[PDB]
Every structure is written in structure tokens, then in C-alpha cells.
Amino acid sequence: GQVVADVLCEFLEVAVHLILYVREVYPVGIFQKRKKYNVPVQMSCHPELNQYIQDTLHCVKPLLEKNDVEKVVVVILDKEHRPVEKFVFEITISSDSLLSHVEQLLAAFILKISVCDAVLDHNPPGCTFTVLVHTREAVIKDFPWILADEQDVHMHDPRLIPLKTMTSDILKMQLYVEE
Amino acid sequence: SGPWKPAKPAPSV
């Protein structure tokens, strides 16, 4: 329960950073490698951006603790505050031996965002982002949450981009065991 | 169900 919310919150935070990096929402100069993970990770060093992402997700954490969260969407906007890109994380077993659970979610997402880096055109300059939280059917000081408008939700003709990983193309891997 | 977002926008840089 608690542990799942914690794993997901950590993952989601790093994920926000890697989206901002790969998509150049902010200048590459604010990003640095984190050797705290045994998977490659770029994260912002910009203290106020980091505080912002952290506050956001630590508001989301209590809802994850009780499975009230249907999805978390990281939305990339031009500064017309139109959604131009939507990273949807739907919220719906393995050993720690090579990768921690957090690192496994990171590896999977890194495989996806790397394809992303190749299929998607560059975004216009001056893009920003926000996070949308999608609760299921049925905190912090001066960090309130409002109801989203339907301007930063819907798109003129959204295109689902299947981010099919490298391996998926190259290799299919199957395990057969005895009796 | 919302959706909900932070009132305060992401910082600038």
C-alpha cells in the first residue's frame, strides 16, 4: 500500500524530469546525470523547478496510497498554454537483484522515451508543462489544486504515438520450462 | 474524477 505509492511517486518525479529533458521543455544546461540510479537518468538541478515537481507529486502521494488515482498526465504546452504533448500514466513479482523496482519502472520508461526522441519533431521554443491528476470514480502550504480547464485537456486532433521499444522490433524473447 | 492541476504554474527559467 504505502510502498506502492512511494515507488510510484519516486518513479513519476524522475519521469517528469526525463520528459522535460528529452523534450527540451527547459534548456539542457539545467540538467545533470544522477548516479544514484543504476539506470541512466538526467534530472534538473534548478532548485525551484525541483521544489515544484516535488510539491506536486507529494500532493499526489496520499491519493496513490489508497488507489484513488486513475492517471497522472504530464502535459507539455506551448506558451499559448495549448497542450501539444500529453504523457499519460495510467494507474492499474521481480527480484531486486539487478534493478530495484523503481529502476525497473525507469528502465521501461527510458526505453519508451528514447524512441520518443526519434519519432517526434522538436517542440517550439518557450514550452512549459503542467501535471493533471485523474481520480477514479469514487496538503502542502500554499500549493493548492484547482479543477483543470477544458483548454489544457483537449486537442485539435490528437495522435496516439505508439512508442514501440527497440527490442520489440529486433527480438522476441520467450521462456519455456519443463513439466 | 477532476482532472486536477496545480493552481500555481511551473516556475520559469
Side-chain angles (χ1 to χ4, degrees):
Chain A
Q2 297 253 313
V3 62
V4 132
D6 217 39
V7 175
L8 283 182
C9 260
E10 186 174 346
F11 168 75
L12 289 162
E13 175 170 14
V14 186
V16 177
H17 282 263
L18 293 162
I19 284 154
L20 301 177
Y21 170 78
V22 175
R23 306 268 70 223
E24 306 184 70
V25 181
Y26 298 98
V28 187
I30 74 157
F31 294 98
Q32 298 291 4
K33 179 173 166 68
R34 307 308 150 110
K35 285 163 86 276
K36 75 167 143 181
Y37 300 109
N38 230 9
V39 179
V41 150
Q42 297 282 343
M43 301 188 68
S44 141
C45 286
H46 194 257
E48 325 82 358
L49 171 57
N50 296 5
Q51 190 52 60
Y52 182 78
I53 299 166
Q54 188 177 290
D55 290 344
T56 305
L57 288 147
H58 293 206
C59 288
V60 176
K61 180 163 180 188
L63 274 50
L64 290 164
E65 263 155 30
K66 256 299 299 161
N67 211 32
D68 287 67
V69 178
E70 160 172 311
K71 38 175 172 154
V72 181
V73 186
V74 183
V75 177
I76 305 180
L77 309 152
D78 49 29
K79 293 228 83 150
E80 272 76 27
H81 224 256
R82 309 190 291 253
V84 293
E85 287 169 13
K86 256 152 118 195
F87 278 87
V88 179
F89 292 95
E90 303 185 55
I91 311 279
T92 29
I93 306 192
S94 76
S95 77
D96 313 17
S97 44
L98 306 132
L99 294 176
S100 57
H101 293 158
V102 163
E103 289 171 330
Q104 288 177 40
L105 303 171
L106 285 180
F109 181 62
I110 283 180
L111 293 182
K112 298 195 97 52
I113 199 72
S114 309
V115 166
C116 175
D117 199 0
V119 58
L120 293 195
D121 275 296
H122 219 156
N123 283 138
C127 281
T128 183
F129 78 102
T130 184
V131 180
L132 297 185
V133 176
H134 271 167
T135 304
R136 301 195 201 274
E137 102 201 18
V139 181
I140 284 89
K141 136 82 179 173
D142 261 287
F143 202 89
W145 289 65
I146 55 168
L147 262 209
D149 190 67
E150 236 185 292
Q151 79 166 37
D152 63 41
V153 178
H154 298 315
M155 288 186 164
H156 290 63
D157 215 13
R159 193 174 46 250
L160 178 267
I161 283 101
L163 300 158
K164 75 165 315 195
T165 67
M166 257 303 165
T167 167
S168 164
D169 280 325
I170 316 180
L171 287 182
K172 168 168 56 170
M173 162 32 234
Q174 256 149 355
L175 176 56
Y176 298 93
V177 165
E178 173 80 281
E179 304 191 27
Chain B
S1 294
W4 310 80
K5 72 177 182 179
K8 275 168 182 146
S12 175
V13 69

